[PDB]
Design a binder for this molecule. Structure first.
Ligand code: GTP
Ligand code: GTP
Ligand code: GDP
Ligand code: MG
Ligand code: MG
Lengths: 51, 426, 51, 427, 436
């Protein structure tokens, strides 16, 4: 039963779990821990409308 | 006006001619039902050369199909532009030769050639002033070679003054379909050197290598080869069909390319041939056409022209262009590789220009080269013929039909004398 | 001579998707075939071999 | 264009019993005779809605014949197309050639005469017989004689079943095979040998049918015949008719003997397994593991070859494969024939029979070649013929039936002449 | 005026993948290669001409050849967005990689790929009419870009020779490294790059990493951003040919004005202002600060210190809104400053250049379109310090005969190792001799 269930595949490759989107929480992670996605600039809170 | 009578023999001839009448019908813009559907009036003025009006714009071709198997006729009527041929021009036996020059030249001809002679006579006197005849056939098969060469001989005896073009495919050892291809080839070429006016040598080896390297098709079926041959034949006859700045008829090509009555074996090339994946790399300029024309990889015969000398050559240009660039380009390619041309004839290159490119094209050119490197191919055939005739392999199916071995000796002699005189002029 | 110039390849043939030997040109043929709607095999010889 | 086929003996009509099953299945003809122009070369369309074959089955024992008459194909075959004698020839060439032939052969030929009269564009005859027996050998040779007298110039494609070297079912089959060859030489225009040990090894090795009967043999032999008449039957890119084997493969009037081959002989599982391409089947059609005659062409030299292709085959790759064959040197050709190949292509793929052991293949190759290993065959058969003839064994059967020592001597020295012939041409 | 550009190796063609993206954006050409249909180019489009050769109607093919031995990255170009721009015949691709092996890349596979590259570059030069010179792209650390690249430079020098060859190579960083045997491959590369090319510009990687970290405020840059600003450097170099400025210099000027000695040709490059969108808003951009900015090590492309060296010559290309009065004033301020020192060999150690057209960047982001920018190409002795740094770590591995068996298994011998080692020592002696 166990090697037919094959739990190791599920733990090593978590296909059931959703992938890494974290649409809005990525913003708060960048704000708190300064951890951006690779190809991104640091984004200030400039009101570009005022200028 | 000036009239071309098309004649097709054998399986090869029947299929390549089907594609030929397809592309000519395309260039004159006539539908597969037989009515004109083009745009300009420039096409209507020279349809008499290839078609005849029957009723209500029904332009039917001036062609004669000839074979021995109905399978060729089924393949004729199956495809489009298979319904526009006159059913009376579907002359066809029933028995079949099948790789036998004897059967193709002594028995099956004996009761087929008379009926085709009646129809080609009716076809010839239906028009006023012939330019000549244009025959496409094979040399490996029986019903094409034997029946074709017998017709060629008989029609040249009756009409000795009219021109004659023959597009004959010759066999190569690397693309070697039949077994008695030498026995049929040697006997046919021995008939051609005495009866045909000039011969355009073709072969499947060059065509396959062209479709691999220059077109880069993965499955080069016969229809593509037939269309490339069709492109050549249409390019040949462009000048009678359309006006230009300097027209050149077939007789004008024959006199500019035949210095001696037995030196009439050409090698042929056509441009442009580029893979449609690279159709935007290349522009359309006369030097771009010339580099592809004079290349050895673009000849339609398995003969390296750099292994010999060009005796003469001719280039037929289609489309609006500049004559200065044409002439100085031919002069430059003549002076640069000066050793590959003969010395006792200056200005070996004849040129011509018509102002209408083929449909879908902007500017094209067709190449006819009378080189002395054609003797390599006939030597490539003669050595096989000697190997067979040494101890008479396959000989009885010929000798037991009405042929003698003296036909084989004289064909051997004529071929050896031809390759000797080509080597002499080298 | 001039037209031999090569040795026939002892190799298997994939489709146009795998990048083996002639996938580029075959891909262009197949693309225009999909553009018109008909298959690659069914094509007029001129459409397949002239400009 | 039509061709009529004749089947002689106990083997002949069992091969026909499988062959005509294939034809019905390829042209979609129900076993009761009606469809639910390509068929017109085999099935004449009598009346309205009924096709009835251009064939004759014949034998001297009525057992296997009326087994046909009561099989699945009762309504398909004309009642009198199947001819049946009263009593067997019983493994005796003289009995099948002089006593019983004199009364069956005349009914056979004035029967095929009106078969030929209903026919219009006859290619020729193709025959199916075995030489180990008496009915196939004796009146098969007697019929072939009177065929050559009547028509002659029409081709005679002969698919004959020679005795295998080791595997054997009879005892006097050397005598009968020799006496039949003595007439098979100057009567059949071209002949294809078919042994049984070679096909048994094929079904054992490739198809992996461990215990095969005759029906498997008959089925794939029918597949061969269909693969070399497919050119007449259907339209191909390059079709070659029946008169081609006459020309492209018979260099001398007494050298007409051809080894046949077929590829791919593959079951239902190895099909999904293997990527069928023209290169490997053109290669596999040359190793003796796929020849229908137990001999080794390594010891011989090829004279001519012919290659039928069926299905999705373009001339490009067949040309490339034969180029690789000509450039290889494991096999060798005679020097007195450089262009040793003929091709032929037809479009329709070979169909499968329900319950058969061959799979639906995209493309197939039927190779028919000439060699000198057949000269090795006749020598190996002549050796064991002399073994029995030195002691004059079994001779009293033939002499009491009507023959004498002369026919034994002359057929012996004729095979000697054929031996000298093959060894002279091969070098 | 036409210049053809060849790309050898994994690094070179990715730089080109960014470089041609920049060019087509500068001349406003869509990825397919046709011009924008709505906007009319006009009859005299001479500017496009140096790189793109007009063929037929409305199609521009670049005078470039990507070539490499592993097919992966090349066919990614063949299947990417620029499928229609290059068609198949210029993108030369091998069958298997050189695998960080100079010998394998120069002798095993080079013998069959270089001839095909050469009679293609012949046809490209035949299509050309006013050939100014070549410019090559390669990273000397790899196998293909080092081995076959040097083989290509040699056979080009025997074909034409007199024409200038701008070599934009990528050297391995001292501490930042991705390969192991790149000391061997770099040394063997310079063995030919010393006497074959004319003008060879060095581009390190860690210096660019420091630039994207500090000025571009990209905390983790990928190769894309590196290749993007390198394409900015190249475009700013050839903008004098592509466009008409107030003071133009062509490609033969670096040949005369920057290389005082036939073997001392290695140029440090720098660019300014490398700046984001926010910093540009907060910073007033003028010529004096960027003329300064072009000389601090915080804006150089090679990780070295010009403080420890003395300048041989400097060249300054200006793009955008630049008048000659204040650039003359800034270089006056520089020549009167004493934080940097020139050699006593050349009193006039500058070469200015002004072009009207401003820098252009990908519209997506990472770089604010500025009014003016500068690209500096100088010559000093810190480059000699770099070579000595690589020579030491080459000698360390060679002393134990490490990794030598792969090369001699390919077919090379200890002779070229020893003679390249002493050749680099000769280069060190030459730098120390001229610097004094
Ligand atoms: N491969 C194969 N061989 C067969 C088949 N039927 C008979 N044979 C062979 O025929 C050979 C002898 O001839 P038979 O068919 O038995 O009988 P016959 O030729 O009609 O001669 P008679 O017995 O006198 O009627 C035997 O060696 C069998 O191997 C068959 O269906 N397939
Ligand atoms: N600037 C930049 N450098 C790169 C890039 N890709 C690779 N490199 C450099 O190239 C060096 C190694 O050579 P590569 O170009 O990767 O590989 P190669 O030169 O083709 O040699 P082979 O892998 O053997 O074919 C590495 O040390 C990198 O620093 C890139 O995209 N941008
Ligand atoms: N290019 C081309 N060659 C063909 C075609 N059909 C047949 N052939 C060639 O013709 C040769 C055989 O000629 P064959 O058909 O026997 O001539 P026939 O029997 O007299 O009609 C072979 O070598 C084929 O390559 C075709 O459609 N195109
Ligand atoms: Mg029996
Ligand atoms: Mg690499």
């Amino acid at each position: 039963g166990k090697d037919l269930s094959r739990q190791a595949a599920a733990v090593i490759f978590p296909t059931d779990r959703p992938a890494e989107e974290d649409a809005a929480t990525r913003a708060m992670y960048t704000r708190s821990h300064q951890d951006f996605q690779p190809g991104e600039q640091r984004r200030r809170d400039y009101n570009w409308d005022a200028a | 006006m000036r009239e071309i009578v098309h004649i097709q023999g054998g399986q090869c001839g029947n299929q390549i001619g089907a594609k030929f009448w397809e592309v000519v019908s395309d260039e004159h813009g006539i539908d597969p039902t037989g009515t004109y559907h083009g745009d300009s009036d420039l096409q209507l003025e020279r349809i008499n050369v290839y078609f005849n009006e029957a009723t209500g714009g029904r332009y039917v071709p001036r062609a004669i199909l000839m074979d021995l198997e109905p399978g060729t006729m089924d393949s004729v009527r199956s495809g489009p532009y298979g319904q526009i041929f006159r059913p009376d021009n579907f002359v066809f036996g029933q028995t079949g030769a099948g790789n036998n020059w004897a059967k193709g030249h002594y028995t099956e001809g004996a009761e087929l050639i008379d009926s085709v002679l009646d129809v080609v006579r009716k076809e010839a006197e239906s028009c006023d002033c012939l330019q000549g005849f244009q025959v496409c056939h094979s040399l490996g098969g029986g019903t094409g070679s034997g029946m074709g060469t017998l017709l060629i001989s008989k029609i040249r005896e009756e009409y000795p003054d009219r021109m004659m073009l023959t597009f004959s495919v010759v066999p190569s050892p690397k693309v070697s379909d039949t077994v008695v291809e030498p026995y049929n080839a040697t006997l046919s070429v021995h008939q051609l050197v005495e009866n045909a006016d000039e011969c355009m040598v073709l072969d499947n080896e060059a065509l396959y290598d062209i479709c691999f390297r220059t077109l880069k098709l993965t499955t080069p079926t016969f229809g593509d080869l037939n269309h490339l041959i069709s492109a050549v034949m249409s390019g040949i006859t462009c000048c009678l069909r359309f006006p230009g700045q300097l027209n050149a008829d077939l007789r004008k090509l024959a006199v500019n390319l035949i210095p001696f009555p037995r030196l009439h074996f050409f090698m042929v090339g056509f441009t442009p041939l580029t893979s449609r994946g690279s159709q935007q790399y290349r522009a359309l300029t006369v030097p771009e056409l010339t580099q592809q024309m004079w290349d050895a990889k673009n000849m339609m015969c398995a003969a390296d022209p750099r292994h010999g000398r060009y005796l003469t050559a001719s280039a037929l240009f289609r489309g609006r262009m500049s004559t200065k660039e044409v002439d100085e380009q031919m002069l430059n390619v003549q002076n640069k590789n000066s050793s590959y041309f003969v010395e006792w004839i200056p200005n070996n290159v004849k040129s011509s220009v018509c102002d209408i490119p083929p449909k879908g094209l902007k500017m094209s050119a067709t190449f006819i080269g009378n080189s002395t490197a054609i003797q390599e191919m006939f030597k490539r055939v003669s050595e096989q013929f000697t190997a067979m005739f040494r101890r008479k392999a396959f000989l009885h199916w010929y000798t037991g039909e009405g042929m003698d071995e003296m036909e084989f000796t004289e064909a051997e002699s004529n071929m050896n004398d031809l390759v000797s005189e080509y080597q002499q002029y080298q | 001579y001039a037209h031999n110039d090569g040795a026939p390849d002892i190799s298997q043939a994939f489709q146009n998707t795998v990048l083996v030997k002639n996938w580029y040109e075959d891909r262009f043929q197949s693309q225009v075939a999909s553009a018109t709607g008909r298959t690659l095999r069914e094509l007029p010889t001129h459409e397949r071999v002239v400009h | 264009r039509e061709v009529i086929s004749i089947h002689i003996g106990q083997a002949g009509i069992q091969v026909g019993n499988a062959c005509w099953e294939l034809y019905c299945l390829e042209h979609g003809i129900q076993p009761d005779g009606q469809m639910p122009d390509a068929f017109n070369t085999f099935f004449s369309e009598t009346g309205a809605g009924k096709h009835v074959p251009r064939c004759i089955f014949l034998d001297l024992e009525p057992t296997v014949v009326d087994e046909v008459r009561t099989g699945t194909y009762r309504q398909l075959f004309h009642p009198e197309q199947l001819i049946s004698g009263k009593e067997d020839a019983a493994n005796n060439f003289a009995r099948g050639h002089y006593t019983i032939g004199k009364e069956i052969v005349d009914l056979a030929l004035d029967r095929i005469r009106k078969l030929a009269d209903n026919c219009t564009g006859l290619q020729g005859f193709l025959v199916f017989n075995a030489v180990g027996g008496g009915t196939g050998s004796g009146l098969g040779s007697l019929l072939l004689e009177r065929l050559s007298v009547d028509y002659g110039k029409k081709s005679k494609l002969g698919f004959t079943v020679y005795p295998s070297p080791q595997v054997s079912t009879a005892v006097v089959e050397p005598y009968n095979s020799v006496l039949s060859t003595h007439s098979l030489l100057e009567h059949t225009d071209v002949a294809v040998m078919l042994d049984n040990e070679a096909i048994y090894d094929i079904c054992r090795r490739s198809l992996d049918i461990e215990r095969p009967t005759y029906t498997n043999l008959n089925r794939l032999i029918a597949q061969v015949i269909s693969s070399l008449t497919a050119s007449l039957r259907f339209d191909g890119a390059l079709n070659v008719d029946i008169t081609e084997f006459q020309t492209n493969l018979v260099p001398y009037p007494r050298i007409h003997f051809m080894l046949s081959s077929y590829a791919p002989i593959i079951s239902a599982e190895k099909a999904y397994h293997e990527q069928l391409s023209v290169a490997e089947i053109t290669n596999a059609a040359f190793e003796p593991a796929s020849m229908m005659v137990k001999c080794d062409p390594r010891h011989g030299k090829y004279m001519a070859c012919c290659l039928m292709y069926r299905g999705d085959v373009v001339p490009k790759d067949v040309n490339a494969s034969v180029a690789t064959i000509k450039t290889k040197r494991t096999i060798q050709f005679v020097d007195w024939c450089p262009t040793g190949f003929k091709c032929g292509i037809n479009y329709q793929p070979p169909t499968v029979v329900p319950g058969g052991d061959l799979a639906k293949v995209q493309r197939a190759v039927c190779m028919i070649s000439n060699s000198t290993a057949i000269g090795e065959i006749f020598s190996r058969l002549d050796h064991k013929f002399d073994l029995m003839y030195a002691k004059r064994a079994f001779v009293h059967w033939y002499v009491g039936e009507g023959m004498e020592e002369g026919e034994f001597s002359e057929a012996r020295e004729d095979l000697a002449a054929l031996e000298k012939d093959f060894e002279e041409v091969g070098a």
